[PDB]
Amino acid sequence: SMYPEQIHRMTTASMLREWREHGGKYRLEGSQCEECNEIFFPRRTVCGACNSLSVKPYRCARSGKIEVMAPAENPILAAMGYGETVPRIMAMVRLDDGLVIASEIVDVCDQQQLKVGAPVRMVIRKHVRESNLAWQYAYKFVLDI
């Protein structure tokens, strides 16, 4: 602050990284194959089913159910930018189109509604800030009831 001597840092992110993933992270866009119609998340260049390069963006279903859930409460494993909210409710969310997303559940107003099979919907939230100072935004989920 008072002494502006540059501090060592191996890695600094270019804006290019997040720029290319705005579809995936703001809009839950994966990929669909034009030849066989198989769907994937996250986005990709080659269809895994048939190895076609004719692949297009696909808007994943933004509603789903909690497939599996696990609290994260261990201070030892608190990542920088995620230390303030404890517990965090980590979940695998099964979307209505069949895909599964690794995320977390937030804004739980009634704890008795937080259970396996509970319906959820996607929301845009602030995530850990980028190493180039830009705010990071991406998906999380809330209970939808």
Partner: protein, 396 residues
């Protein structure tokens, strides 16, 4: 094709404990020169090295091969690096096997290390080896994946009311195996009661995490007699790769392996099943033939791998453990050194940690010996089974 023998294997003792007074170079040298001594071999007889670690983010040292060749004092002999999560050593072992089997090198040192304490807080760095833009940068860890996998296993195979009993029985057997194993972090510790374990962290199934280096020395069959009376042969290996993204465990059309189960996920690791089937076909064995094994233990991951590996049927590993199946007198003795819970875990070294205990078992030198052991198997994984390795060793 010609056969490849392990002539010695060794690691820096108590791998669930840290060595803050050593540098990574010093630590690598310790296990390397110990193994060289065990084999009655000079460092300058080494023709190549295959070595593993997590990556350059821990110590800020990249392009590490030449640095290791210089540290061991083998220049110009090359060091081929491997960067593959907790499977780094397992992968480097497979690389060394290829180096010898090819005829390009006759004597090869395989191994790996991890110096977590060079990083201020390694626990938050590890996530960098995942599908980073969609997990690491959203604060999602490998440990989250294992917690979820365990929850899926218990909820879907009807273990409600016995989760604590299963995890505690597992962790207790690991502690029993570690108690009498001098290289284990829990060597000499008293065995807590099942009830004490149930009321402790992760019902007693949390691993002990520290620092270690390790290596095994591979030699062409025709040379092995110069270095040992009792060589351990590599029957077959498989290494397999699927997406790091945890969601893909439930739906991965990219994974082409015929005859997988209909329903796959975290509790049923498709990549691990495929890996085991490939490995066993190459080795000329089936699960029936396995006399002793090693798996990456942590929470319920040992159960999922017991099933993937073919030791018991889908959903039956919990009951197998409860019925005493992994004890020394059980149907399949498993993690006889104590595993990650009892012996300890150091990511890049873990492959050698498995291989060393199997090596000892197959020569009759284990502290918890399986009488008449002919076949030994290492099942190891990296990420949430994004990497998977299965290595099959025999003694004839």
């Amino acid at each position: 094709a010609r056969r490849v023998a392990i002539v010695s294997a060794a690691y820096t003792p108590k791998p669930g404990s840290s060595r803050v007074r050593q540098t990574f170079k010093e630590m690598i040298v310790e296990s390397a020169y110990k193994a060289l001594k065990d084999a009655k071999m000079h460092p300058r007889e080494i023709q190549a090295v295959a070595y593993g670690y997590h990556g350059e983010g821990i110590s800020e040292y990249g392009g590490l091969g030449p640095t290791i060749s210089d540290a061991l004092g083998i220049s110009p002999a090359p060091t081929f690096m491997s960067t593959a999560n907790c499977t780094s050593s397992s992968v480097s072992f497979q690389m060394g096997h290829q180096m010898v089997a090819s005829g390009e090198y006759d004597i090869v040192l395989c191994g790996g290390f991890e110096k977590m304490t060079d990083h201020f807080n390694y626990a938050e760095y590890i996530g960098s080896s995942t599908e980073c833009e969609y997990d690491y940068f959203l604060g999602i860890s490998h440990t989250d994946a294992f917690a979820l996998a365990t929850a899926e296993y218990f909820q879907k195979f009807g273990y409600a009311g016995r989760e604590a009993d299963v995890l505690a029985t597992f962790g207790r057997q690991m502690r029993i195996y570690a108690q009498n194993t001098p290289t284990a972090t829990r060597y000499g510790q008293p065995i807590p009661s099942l009830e004490v374990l149930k009321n402790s962290e992760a019902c007693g199934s949390m691993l002990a995490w520290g620092e270690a280096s390790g290596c095994a020395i591979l030699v062409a069959e025709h040379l092995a007699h110069k270095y040992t009376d009792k060589p351990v042969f590599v029957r077959g290996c498989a290494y397999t790769g699927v997406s790091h993204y945890f969601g893909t465990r439930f739906h991965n059309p990219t994974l082409h392996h015929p005859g997988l189960p209909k329903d796959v996920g975290m509790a049923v690791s498709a990549n691990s099943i495929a890996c085991a089937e490939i490995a066993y076909k190459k080795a000329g064995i089936t699960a029936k033939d396995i006399d002793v094994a090693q798996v990456y233990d942590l929470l319920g991951a040992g159960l999922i791998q017991m099933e993937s590996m073919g030791i018991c049927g889908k959903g039956q590993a919990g009951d197998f453990v409860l019925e005493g199946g992994i004890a020394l007198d059980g149907q399949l003795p498993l993690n006889t050194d104590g595993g990650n819970i009892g012996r300890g875990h150091a990511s890049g070294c873990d492959g050698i940690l498995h291989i060393t205990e199997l090596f000892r078992q197959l020569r009759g030198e284990s502290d918890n010996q399986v009488k008449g052991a002919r076949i030994g198997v290492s099942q190891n994984l990296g990420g949430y089974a994004a990497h998977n390795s299965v290595i099959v060793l025999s003694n004839d």
